[PDB]
Amino acid sequence: THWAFSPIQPGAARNMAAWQIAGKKDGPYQIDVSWPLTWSESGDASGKSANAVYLVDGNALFLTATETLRRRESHRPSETGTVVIAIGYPITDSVFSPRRSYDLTPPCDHYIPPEGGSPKPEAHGGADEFLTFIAEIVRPFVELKVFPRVSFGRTALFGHSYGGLFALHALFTKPSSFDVYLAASPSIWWNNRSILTEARRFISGFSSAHPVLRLSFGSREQYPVRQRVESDEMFKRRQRAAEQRRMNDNCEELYSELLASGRLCKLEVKEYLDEDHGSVIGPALSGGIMFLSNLSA
What are the phi and psi torsion angles at 140 (to 5°)? -65, -35
Residue 250 binds Cl ion, judged by CB under 5 A: no
Of 227, 239, 244, 256, the one binding a copy of itself (CB under 8 A) is 227
**Binding pattern for the stretch 69-98 against a copy of itself, x by CB under 8 A and - elsewhere:** -xxx-xx----------x-x-x-xxxxx--
* Residue 214 binds to Cl ion (criterion: CB under 5 A): no
Asked whether the beta carbons of 217 and 247 are under 8 A apart, the reply is yes
Using the rule CB under 8 A, is 14 a contact of a copy of itself? yes
Task: Using CB under 8 A, pick the residue from 144, 207, 208, 229 that binds a copy of itself.
Answer: 229
Distances (CA, A) of 147 to 52, 123, 173: 11, 34, 28
Greatest CA span in the chain, whole angstroms?
A: 73
Site string for Cl ion, 152-171 (x = CB under 5 A): --x-----------------
Does 51 contact Cl ion by CB under 5 A?
yes
Using CB under 5 A as the binding rule, whether residue 224 contacts Cl ion is answered as yes
The residues in 157-176 that bind a copy of itself, with binding defined as CB under 8 A, are none
Q: Does 277 bind Cl ion (CB under 5 A)?
A: no
Please tell me the distance from the alpha carbon of residue 289 to that of residue 220, in angstroms, as a whole number. 22
- Shortest distance (Å) from residue 209 CB to a copy of itself: 22
Residues 270, 275, 281: CA angle, nearest 5 degrees: 75
Q: In what order do the strands lie in the sheet with 266-272?
A: 29-34, 81-88, 50-56, 152-160, 180-184, 212-218, 266-272
Q: Could you say whether residue 151 binds Cl ion (CB under 5 A)?
A: no
6: partner contacted, choices Cl ion, a copy of itself, none (Cβ within 5-8 A by kind): a copy of itself
Task: Choose which of 20, 40, 256, 296 interacts with Cl ion (CB under 5 A).
Answer: 296
DSSP 8-state assignment for residue 117: -
- Choosing among Cl ion, a copy of itself, none, which partner's interface includes residue 32 (Cβ < 5 to 8 Å by kind)? a copy of itself
What contacts 49, CB < 8 A, 6 or more positions away?
80, 150, 151, 152, 153
Q: Which of 83, 111, 91, 102 is nearest to 25 (CA)?
A: 102
Is residue 32 at the binding interface for a copy of itself, with CB under 8 A as the rule? yes
Residue 276 phi, psi (nearest 5): -105, -175
Q: Which of 1, 228, 233, 262 binds Cl ion (CB under 5 A)?
A: 228
Element of type H or E holding 160: strand 152-160
Among 3, 42, 47, 232, binds a copy of itself (CB under 8 A): 3
Q: Which is nearer to a copy of itself, 112 or 265 (CB)?
A: 265
Element (H, E) at 223: none
Candidate list 51, 56, 59, 224; residue touching a copy of itself; CB under 8 A: 59
**Residue 228 binding a copy of itself, by CB under 8 A:** yes
**Shortest Å, Cβ 165 to Cl ion:** 21
Comparing CA positions, the residue from 129, 70, 75 lying closest to residue 102 is 129
Q: Which does 74 bind (CB under 5 to 8 A by kind): Cl ion, a copy of itself, none?
A: a copy of itself
Q: Rounded to an integer, what distance in angstroms lies between the CA atom of residue 133 and that of residue 117?
A: 34
- Which residues sit at the interface with Cl ion, rule CB under 5 A? 51, 154, 220, 224-225, 228, 276, 294-296
